[PDB]
């Protein structure tokens, strides 16, 4: 189904999900409750950001902060989400996540990061 | 006028205002516009496409309603 903005990012992130374990992005909500999803994505673009293998699902309190802060530190990502907010709610809104990844994606492409595959 | 917004709103499953250049062209041809592919590319070449990846449809809507 190409007719869907959310579908574009879904397959995009899911493509990287095949290169990870303990993570499965079914939807932009429940699948992000693990927190690791954020770090997995950031780690894929920034290998020198942190060690994903050293990250524990129980370290969710620091996981969100690590992902957000590092992304904002190396890619000046707009902090539309909060650590406390995400942990307290557990399940974030798909629109909030979409917008976060939206600007992030744009920022990565304009900096020649996502365009790592030409033809 | 809202029909144009809704047309893009069907594609934009979140309501942000940003879509792909590929989907954008599909909406333009879906509306049954009387513009050729050449003209589409003309406007496209005068916009941001191969830069950030997300094309704001709002710009096209306004432009279309002006002409």
From Swiss-Prot, chain A:
Tissue specificity statement from the Swiss-Prot or TrEMBL entry: Widely expressed, with highest expression in skeletal muscles (at protein level). Within striated muscles, significantly more expressed in soleus muscle compared with plantaris muscle or white vastus (at protein level). 30-40% lower expression in females than in males (at protein level). Expressed in type 2a fibers, but not detected in fast twitch type 2b muscle white vastus nor in oxidative type I/b heart muscle (at protein level). Expressed within myometrial cells of the uterus, as well as in the endometrial layer. In the aorta, confined to smooth muscle cells.
Domain spans labelled Calponin-homology (CH): 6-109
Regulation: induction: Significantly reduced by exercise in smooth and in skeletal muscles.
TM helices/strands, residue ranges: none
Disruption phenotype: Male mutant mice perform better than wild type in exercise stress test after endurance training. Females do not differ significantly during these tests. Even in the absence of endurance exercise, mutant mice exhibit muscle fiber adaptation, i.e. more type 2a fibers and lower levels of type 1b fibers. Endothelium-dependent vasorelaxation of the aorta is enhanced and responses to beta-adrenergic constriction are reduced. Expression of PPP1R12A is 30-40-fold higher in mutant mice than in wild-type littermates and exhibits a steady decline as the animals become sexually mature (at protein level).
Region of interest (Calmodulin-binding), ranges: 101-119
Protein location: Cytoplasm, Myofibril, Sarcomere, I band; Cytoplasm, Myofibril, Sarcomere, M line; Nucleus
Primary role: Plays a role in the regulation of contractile properties of both striated and smooth muscles. When unphosphorylated, may inhibit myosin dephosphorylation.
Quaternary structure (record): Interacts with PPP1R12A.
Family stated for the protein in its record: Belongs to the smoothelin family.
Protein known as: Smoothelin-like protein 1
Curated annotation (Swiss-Prot), chain B:
Positions that bind Ca(2+) 4: 48, 50, 52, 54, 59
Coiled-coil blocks: none
Residue ranges of every copy of the EF-hand domain listed in the record: 1-34, 35-67
N6,N6,N6-trimethyllysine modifications at: 34
List of residues binding Ca(2+) 3: 12, 14, 16, 18, 23
Domain of life (superkingdom): Eukaryota
Additional detail: This protein has four functional calcium-binding sites.
Similarity remark: Belongs to the calmodulin family.
Reported function: Calmodulin acts as part of a calcium signal transduction pathway by mediating the control of a large number of enzymes, ion channels, aquaporins and other proteins through calcium-binding. Calcium-binding is required for the activation of calmodulin. Among the enzymes to be stimulated by the calmodulin-calcium complex are a number of protein kinases, such as myosin light-chain kinases and calmodulin-dependent protein kinase type II (CaMK2), and phosphatases.
Protein name: Calmodulin-1
Part of the intact protein present: 83 to 149 of 149
């Amino acid at each position: 189904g190409p007719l869907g903005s959310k579908n574009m990012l879904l397959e995009w992130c899911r493509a990287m999900t095949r290169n990870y374990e303990h993570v499965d992005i079914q939807n932009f909500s429940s699948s992000w409750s693990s927190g690791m999803a954020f770090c997995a994505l950031i780690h894929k673009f920034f290998p020198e950001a942190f060690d994903y293998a050293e990250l524990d699902p129980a370290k969710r309190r620091h996981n969100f902060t690590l992902a957000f802060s590092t992304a904002e530190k190396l890619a000046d990502c707009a902090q539309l989400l909060e650590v406390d907010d995400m942990v307290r709610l557990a399940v974030p809104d798909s629109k909030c996540v979409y917008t976060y990844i939206q600007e992030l994606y744009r920022s990565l492409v304009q900096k020649g990061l996502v365009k790592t595959k030409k033809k | 006028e809202e029909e144009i917004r809704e047309a893009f709103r069907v594609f934009d499953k979140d309501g942000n205002g940003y879509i792909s250049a590929a989907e954008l062209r599909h909406v333009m041809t879906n509306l049954g516009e009387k513009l050729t592919d050449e003209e589409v590319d003309e406007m496209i070449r005068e916009a941001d496409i191969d830069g950030d990846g997300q094309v704001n449809y709002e710009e096209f809507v306004q432009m279309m309603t002006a002409k």
